[PDB]
């Protein structure tokens, strides 16, 4: 549920940056790869992470385990939004993401 080690994981960030950017980095600062983690899942381009993008951030298809059920996914996304989003906009900005 948006765990610190999940965003701070290097291999996940490396797999997502594979192909799109052609410079593989052996090491990166946790803040740098958390900026990369925020940027990779913003598919629309509005620099805001809404519930639908976090749905593809939490559940995943990586090439296994059965896909997470609807109720658990709803609970995780609702918890993340209620904890990190304080402006009641329904989105999460980078300030909100970096705060928690």
């Amino acid at each position: 549920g948006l765990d610190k080690n999940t965003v701070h994981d290097q291999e996940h960030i490396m797999e997502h940056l594979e192909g799109v950017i052609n410079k593989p980095e052996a090491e990166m600062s946790p803040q740098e790869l958390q900026l990369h983690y925020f940027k990779m899942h913003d598919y629309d381009g509005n620099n805001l992470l809404d519930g639908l993008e976090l749905s593809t951030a939490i559940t995943h298809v990586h090439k296994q385990a059965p896909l997470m059920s609807e109720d658990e996914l709803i609970n995780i996304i609702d918890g993340v939004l209620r904890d990190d989003d304080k402006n009641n906009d329904g989105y999460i900005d980078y300030a909100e993401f970096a705060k928690s």
């Binding site: 896909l67 300030a95 970096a98």
Partner: protein, 326 residues
């Protein structure tokens, strides 16, 4: 008013469908084909009916719905068409634009076929029903229409974007017709003042196809809860300090520009990276017909070349035979 995005009543690409093959929080039925970029509610086949409805009911006193969709057809006339619903119960299957009749709610019908014969279709018709009235599909809902705007939405170079706003018991539909790629180019289509809708209900999209066949695709559905400035939450007191807000965003923008500079020289670094334009995608029906005629003339041209060459050969051989005998 203040806008809040609702993910449980929304869907969009490019990861629209999960690994199972179903849209999250939405149930699809009929001939709908959910894909990873859009939902083909009704494919271009005879007698197709499809619908996608929200699972959980939404309790919003004021709301905004942004539907991006494409209706494509080979001919100039189109199929039955599309419908956006905010009902009490899930219509799913039925005879009204691929959904059931006797709905208690509101329906914005993008009707592409002219059943009445009034030569005013395609059109957008706002109809509110309470569960006892029957939609007269042969009359295009002309008697039951609460609003009607005649805006052609078929065969457009860019996707059509409809925005449906319920606010202070007023329902306004504003449509970007898809002539320009700019998303925020909405133009007023219709409004209905002082309409009462059920307090909580399901959002839905449905599409149907008659004798003629169109492809009805929904690229994105976006739902926003609307709150009045007077009825706002008391304070966003949860926010800690503006100083960290003025410390984080310039670092974020510095990262964005550094990532862009990292991207630029390696986009050209790998020669396999290319780019495909979208100019070929758009062509009108009459333009395609004229191009087909121009393509058809090529057979005549080639046959004329063949005849000319055969005439050249017969002339040359008659010439040499005449020279030989003489």
């Amino acid at each position: 008013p203040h806008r809040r995005f609702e993910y449980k009543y929304s869907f969009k690409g490019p990861h629209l469908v999960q690994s199972d093959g179903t849209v999250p929080f939405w149930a699809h039925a009929g001939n709908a084909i959910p894909s990873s970029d859009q939902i083909r509610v009704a494919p271009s086949l005879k007698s197709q009916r499809g619908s996608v409805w929200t699972k959980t009911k939404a309790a919003f006193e004021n709301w905004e719905v942004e539907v991006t969709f494409r209706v494509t057809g080979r001919g100039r006339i189109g199929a039955d068409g599309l419908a956006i619903w905010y009902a009490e119960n899930q219509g799913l299957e039925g005879p009204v634009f691929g959904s059931a009749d006797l709905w208690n709610g509101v329906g914005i019908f993008f009707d592409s076929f002219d059943n009445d014969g009034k030569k005013n279709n395609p059109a957008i018709v706002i109809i509110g029903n309470n569960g006892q009235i029957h939609y007269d599909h042969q009359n295009d809902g002309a008697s039951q229409a609460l609003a009607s705007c005649q805006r052609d939405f078929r065969n457009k170079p860019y996707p059509v974007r409809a925005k449906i706003t319920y606010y202070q018991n007023t329902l306004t539909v504003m449509i970007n017709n898809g002539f320009t790629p700019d998303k925020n180019d909405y133009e007023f289509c219709a409004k209905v003042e002082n309409m009462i809708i059920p307090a909580q209900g399901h959002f839905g999209i449905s599409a149907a196809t008659g004798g003629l066949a169109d492809d009805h695709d929904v690229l994105s559905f976006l739902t926003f809860q609307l709150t009045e400035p007077g009825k706002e939450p008391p304070t966003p007191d949860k926010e800690i300090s503006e100083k960290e807000k003025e410390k984080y965003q310039e670092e974020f923008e510095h990262f964005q520009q550094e990532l862009d500079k990292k991207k630029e020289e390696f986009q050209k670094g790998h020669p396999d990276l290319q780019g495909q334009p979208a100019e070929e995608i758009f062509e009108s029906v009459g333009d395609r017909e004229l191009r087909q005629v121009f393509e058809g003339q090529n057979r005549i041209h080639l046959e004329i070349k063949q005849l000319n060459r055969q005439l050249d050969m017969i002339l040359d051989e008659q010439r040499r035979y005449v020279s030989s005998l003489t």
